[PDB]
Every structure is written in C-alpha cells, then in structure tokens.
Design a protein around this ligand. Structure first.
Ligand SMILES: O=C(O)[C@H]1[C@@H]2C=C[C@@]3(CN(CCc4ccccc4)C(=O)[C@@H]13)O2
Length: 134
C-alpha cells in the first residue's frame, strides 16, 4: 500500500458550492460556465508505481492527467487553458497548482469520512466540490 491509497477509486460529484464564481475568477466565459456548471463528473483516480492518473468523465468534457508527485507537467484544462501543473502531497492532501499567463490557481483534494472533498481557490474565491464513491 502506498501514497494515495485512500484516493484511489471511482467517485461521483454530489455537490458544488461557489463554482460559477470560481470559474469567473479563473476567466471562464459565460457559455462555458453555464454548461460546465451542470456537469456531475465521474472522477477515476488510479496509481501504477509512481504514476498517478486522474480521469474526469462527464457530458461537458472527458479529461485525463497522469503525473509523478512534485514533477511539473503540461495540462490543457477543460476550459482550454494551457497551464503548467504541479501536484504534491502535503500532509495527506493532494495539492494541485496550475500556472498560466502569470496567474495561479490551487486545487486541493482531501479524504474526509467517506467523501473526497475538493477545494478550488483563485485569488480570494473558493469553491468546494464534494464527491462520493460511485
Ligand atoms: O475537480 C473538480 O471538481 C474541479 C477542479 C477545478 C476545476 C476542475 C476540472 N474538473 C474536471 C473537468 C470539468 C470542469 C468543469 C466542469 C466539469 C468537468 C472538475 O471537475 C473541476 O478540477
């Protein structure tokens, strides 16, 4: 057993708070915000050796990232930002920083009870997204 055991699995979004304002702060346009905001993604987290893969599947977009902790990688976000991403473990919390155009946003994922809680921060705006096991 290992680094992300407690994240691994299939998860379904059950609640979202403040996500439209988070997207606005990030720079997402009106139409994308409205469509993206309806989606209830299935997130699939898996580990193979040192490589973590996070897939998100929904009616809006299907995305996939694979990475090694601490090692920066290129990412195209669902809203079509081209970002430089680094994901680390900080006391049991997966911390994902995305940098683009002199801007930065941080996405934190933590296991709380039987849920996976996702905190998305851009400047002063925080959104919380809660996932249950699928
Ligand atoms: O993990 C989350 O809950 C949040 C966090 C911040 C942004 C995303 C990207 N992502 C997958 C692509 C997407 C985007 C918008 C709506 C549906 C699907 C999320 O679901 C968003 O990671």
């Amino acid at each position: 057993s290992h680094m992300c055991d407690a994240f691994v699995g299939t998860w379904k979004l059950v609640s979202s708070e403040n996500f439209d304002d988070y997207m606005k702060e990030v720079g997402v346009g009106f139409a994308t915000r409205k469509v993206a905001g309806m989606a209830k993604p299935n997130m699939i987290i898996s580990v193979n050796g040192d490589v973590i893969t996070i897939k998100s599947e929904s009616t809006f977009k299907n995305t996939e990232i694979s990475f090694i902790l601490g090692q920066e990688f290129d990412e195209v976000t669902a809203d079509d930002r081209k970002v430089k991403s680094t994901i680390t473990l900080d006391g049991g919390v997966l911390v994902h920083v995305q940098k683009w155009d002199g801007k930065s946003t941080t996405i934190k994922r933590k296991r709380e009870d039987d849920k996976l809680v996702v905190e998305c921060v851009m400047k002063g705006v925080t959104s919380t997204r809660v996932y249950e096991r699928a």
